[PDB]
């Protein structure tokens, strides 16, 4: 996990990604092919995304995609067998914003399709650490970009984040950004990854933030370290 067969070269104000350089990035679409959220493959049978995305078993997981405007591009449209929304997801505060998707048929891993690593509950990714977020969300706050985008951004300390969002920042949230880039409409559920011993590890899941996708405002993500025990437990039980 965390090691792309195709190395990446390093969302508002981000840049186009190298095709297939973020192999765990998936597109969550409805039965018609409409992209409503992103997600991350954690293994061949499971995808992690945001609880607010409201994924259902009628939706599909699209892996190995780069250009959503290309009909010829080879991709994997995977059916969803069951949706596991974290029962602690708070629809009011948006805390514990995570959901697991168990695929009906396993994804076929390859040079453009593979898993991201998961952190340990005790992992500490220091503030200021440069991480990356990816997705097909808006690049301007309007239709989504066809090609997968990426952006490098720093993690923010809770103290620094709270300087803007105050008490809206909860324990299962981690902030990043306010650095000239911003996740935006359509990026939700996607990954916020940081390197752990060289391997890209899922530190956050795009959740919420500025209602205008401001690049000078902290973006808020579901803190994976605070939710990974729930993840492992769900996989072990299913």
């Amino acid at each position: 996990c965390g090691v792309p067969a195709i190395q990446p070269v390093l969302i508002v104000n981000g840049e186009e990604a190298v095709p297939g350089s973020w192999p765990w990035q998936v597109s969550l679409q409805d039965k018609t092919g409409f992209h409503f959220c992103g997600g991350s493959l954690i293994n061949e049978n499971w995808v992690v995304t945001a609880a607010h995305c409201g994924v259902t078993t009628s939706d599909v997981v699209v892996a190995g995609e780069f250009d959503q405007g290309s009909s010829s591009e080879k991709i994997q449209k995977l059916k969803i067998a069951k949706v596991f929304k974290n029962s602690k997801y708070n629809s009011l505060t948006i805390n514990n914003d995570i959901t697991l998707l168990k695929l009906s048929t396993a994804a076929s891993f390859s040079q453009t399709v593979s898993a991201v690593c998961l952190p340990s509950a005790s992992d500490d990714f220091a503030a200021g650490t440069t991480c990356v977020t990816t997705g097909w969300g808006l690049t301007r706050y309007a239709n989504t970009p066809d090609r997968l985008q990426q952006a490098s951004l720093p993690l923010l300390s809770n103290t620094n984040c709270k300087k803007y969002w105050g008490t809206k920042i909860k324990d299962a949230m981690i902030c990043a950004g306010a650095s000239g880039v911003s996740s935006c409409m359509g990026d939700s559920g996607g990954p916020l990854v940081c390197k752990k011993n060289g391997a890209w590890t899922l530190v956050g899941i795009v959740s919420w933030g500025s209602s205008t996708c401001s690049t000078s405002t902290p973006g808020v993500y579901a803190r994976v370290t605070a939710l990974v025990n729930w993840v492992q437990q769900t996989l072990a039980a299913n």
Binding site: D30, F34, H35, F36, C37, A50, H52, C53, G54, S91, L92, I94, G137, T144, S183, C184, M185, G186, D187, S188, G189, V206, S207, W208, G209, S210, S211
Partner: protein
């Protein structure tokens, strides 16, 4: 009809791109808009039918 039917559509702070319906009093019908996934106001429906049954004529 409920006054919430007269409120403009509300996307919210979450970053999803979910298609929902809202009643547009200026046009007299329900239209689509993109909902962010959280903190939906009441003029937000999963189908045009639900929207028209709740806000039609507002």
């Amino acid at each position: 009809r409920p006054d919430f039917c007269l409120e403009p559509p509300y996307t919210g702070p979450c970053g999803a791109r979910i298609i929902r319906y809202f009643y547009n009093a200026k046009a007299g019908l329900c239209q689509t808009f993109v909902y962010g996934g959280c903190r939906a106001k009441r003029n937000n429906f999963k189908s045009a039918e639900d929207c028209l049954r709740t806000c039609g004529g507002a």
